[model samples]
Target chain A: EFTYSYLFRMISHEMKQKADQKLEQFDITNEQKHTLGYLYAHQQDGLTQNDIAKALQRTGPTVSNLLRNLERKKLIYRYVDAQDTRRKNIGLTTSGIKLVEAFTSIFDEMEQTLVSQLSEEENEQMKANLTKMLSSLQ
Target chain B: EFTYSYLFRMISHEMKQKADQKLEQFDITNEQKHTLGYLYAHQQDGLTQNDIAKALQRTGPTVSNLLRNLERKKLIYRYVDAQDTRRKNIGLTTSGIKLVEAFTSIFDEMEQTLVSQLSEEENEQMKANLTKMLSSLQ
Candidate 1:
């Protein structure tokens, strides 16, 4: 279909399919990989389970379940806060950090490939028009 | 957030959210609406459950479930094929046609609004760039 919605849906679907296939070898769900990436990005903020839930827009129980699975995989760890002993902080393991790098590079490579297909002016114009359309909808 | 993926994801999310809210009064899911639209557009082809499954990229069981629900709602009906008694054909009810029109109008309105936000040249450029990126991924 030539419709914007159709194109957007197909592109998004294809991207997800490709990413999922590439990520399958890592033995991690897309949601779990996203959580790992989020933790890596915001580790300095000293995140908790609730923080993860909010960031991922998932329920507490779901995030708890995910975190538990990641912990089981030895990709993440939790320890009591240094300043506030009552609060437990979540952190990535050494392997988790390296895994994040691998996935991040994959995503970045895809983005670069997408950008490379367009001219510089085309990229700028596309972004501007997309922003305008999005703002209008909002 | 500046990435193309982020923008595309957010735009798609917002569009879906808006459309779902609009369609809530009709008590239809997006997939159901899409099914209705496909039927509306291809009413001439004499579609079957398998055809719908292929069109929607849904499993046979899932499409059967959906069709059964639609049948229960009086939005569609099953009739035996005239050419072949053993085969069944699916067609929309009068109410289904009307509902399809309503939802199709809402989608068209959204598309018009998105297109309205950009200049004619911008629209062309955006479509071109999006098509390019989609082709690259494929």
Candidate 2:
């Protein structure tokens, strides 16, 4: 008998591969794209590494490494915070914004295809239930 | 408003984090444990990197990296195949077997907990559906 954990891992692995393939044209890792998506979503206020860490629920070092990769790719820039020189504020560069714009529709289409099997009501319920489970686990 | 791709990504992220946390105590990464698990399942005939890659549905480089990490940790040892010098045969160390034995119950319990909310029929349906999706995507 297949275990639930095994099934989940297999499904998650497949989805990750598909996502990585989708994001490859942008020359970005999935983590990098996720960070960029969050930044783009909050472009007005901007983001700090700490804030990004919280939003992504990732470790500071993970965020820092991702920022370094993005910076190296010239997709984003980090500025030292004026109030606290130790803190770094991050934002997408023109190139970064351009990449996001180019890939937004592809991401949207991928999203639609992924949920195509579920009805609207089922999708909503699944999301809510999964979110609750995630919160409980965390 | 949530896209299925995003939901899938979020779930993948959560699952990876949880699995890594569980495996951390054994000083293994999720990928490393996956390698070990695969080895445990197919140890009788001995397997090569390419064989493991096919089983894991991962790229050759990914398998190479996993083997390197496992060898470094002394969990597995590799030898040149006598019949084909280019082929590398992989086998678990005594410690590797012990490690798998130690973690088997943890993995089983976690699997049980993950699907606790689903009825037996629902869980079986999910397993079959997810397996089909995985094969189709691959």
Candidate 3:
């Protein structure tokens, strides 16, 4: 019952807290943050709704719901592609870019805070261990 | 940026799903399962609600709500701790103990499943590395 799997799980819980604590003020959940972060990463390429579902591993209805929520927030929008009238591409309004940046920066700051606790060599060793664990699981 | 911390985050999501998928057959959520697991582990020790809150790092209202729900499901109960009337000690019903054992065994099974995929040396090395990662985070 007690295993390092629990360790990873606990760390994941602890790791999510700092950002989520502040997220309430912004009225966003971590799930929303992940979807927005994904879009932000690929915004320059102008991805379609299907692409978001596939890339984010979300189903079409869920993705549509998320898109609708973000649109209501005035963060993102969709438009029919020039070449494919039936396919719509998703985009961030300028405010969306700013919001995503703000939340994304929280991750960078937290990771720094996390690694700042360990040495450079410790970092490499743990990553190697995680790689081995991940491979074993696969 | 992409880091092993992010890797840990993703794996936590994946591992929970693999267990929770089976848990769906029982209609008990991963969070609820975790609560039951914690209670089962400390059954002999007779944990107070606050102790659970501290160990689980959950808030009072949240734990209270979950405890109330579990009670409704006939899984747990509370009584005045002989030593402290102000604090109620939590206990499991017969069904609660049985249910806890069922879900708690899943993690043990998973950890074993993970171990079978690796050499003995690899298993110890991975646990040691995970310990290192957790310590560094702390």
Candidate 4:
């Protein structure tokens, strides 16, 4: 009955705690790691601060506060657009790039440790289910 | 391609952030509500501190600190065993029961919004996949 939500919650919670332990060296929470990684990925042309919140599904003010902390950590920084000063953009610092690499470098090992248990077909089916579940929550 | 861990982290992180807004009025984190709910279920013979830790799959000190916080909230109170005063047992205060009800009461609406997207068969399948993934991580 309620097992589905509980299962998802515990698995997600446990995974983060474990990942946080691994990421302690970088002084990053799993939340910050993922947040910065998204910024890292899309800063190529120009990344709006609001777009980061939308993609992370967080509120604009919440993202703004978090970005300030990340900016304090020197993981990321902001700049005003030369073309449009009202429109500010974000990008990671050199260390932010390294920080993201450090965070992602753990995922492959973790993925194999966790996902390798499922059969090929089961993996595909689970992927579709997870995507549907995520979209439903949004 | 098995970015399963990252996906799980994001989904869980987002889910908690959303649920937390609703839980704020109660002045409890999502984890605390569930922790009390778990204690509420094992009220029969009485539950020891370590037992709750085992049930929650948390370390002893982790559960102890959480219980202390719950105890302060008056949501739970502990009793020393008559035969074994060294071993203290825990129970929900009257308010604890009401608090848990308020907490769990949100789950159905959340489930409808989130889990309802999946069909019955899909829910069960994802349940298994998530369980397997969780266990293998350990």
Best by lDDT: 1
* Residue-level error in angstroms, candidate 4, position B78: 6.6
True contacts kept of each: 0.66, 0.39, 0.34, 0.56
Name the runs in model 4 displaced over 4 angstroms: A13-106, A112-125, B30-35, B43-91
Q: What DockQ does each prediction reach against the true complex?
A: 0.48, 0.27, 0.22, 0.35
Looking at candidate 3, what is the lDDT of residue B93?
Answer: 86
Candidate 4 docking: what grade? acceptable
Which one wins by lDDT: 1 or 2? 1
Per-residue lDDT of B46 in model 3: 86
Q: What TM-score would chain B of candidate 2 score versus the native chain B?
A: 0.67
lDDT of each: 0.86, 0.77, 0.77, 0.79
Question: Across residues A1-138, which tens digit of lDDT does each residue of candidate 1 receive?
Answer: 277887788888888888888798788998898899999999889999989999999999999999999999899999999899878999999999999998889889888888888888878877777777778768
Candidate 2 reference-contact recovery: 0.39
Candidate 2 has an lDDT of 0.77
Best by DockQ: 1
Task: Give a tens-digit lDDT track for model 1, residues B112-135.
Answer: 877788778777777877888888
- Each candidate: chain B TM-score: 0.68, 0.67, 0.63, 0.71
What TM value does model 1 have? Answer: 0.70
Docking quality class, candidate 2: acceptable
Residue B99 alpha-carbon offset, candidate 4, angstroms: 2.4
Candidate 2 deviant stretches above 4 angstroms: A1-102, A114-116, B48-74, B77-88, B119-138
Across B3-78, the per-residue lDDT of candidate 4 in tens digits comes to 6875676677777777887789889875687688887787777789888878778798888898899888888888
**What lDDT tens digits, residue by residue, belong to model 2 across residues B13-130?**
7766777788888988766777898888897776999888998788989889889888888999988889989887899999999999888878777767767866666556556655
lDDT of 2 by residue, A1-138 (tens): 676556566767777687678788778877888898889888676578889999999999999899898889899987877888877779899999998887766656666765675677766766665554455456
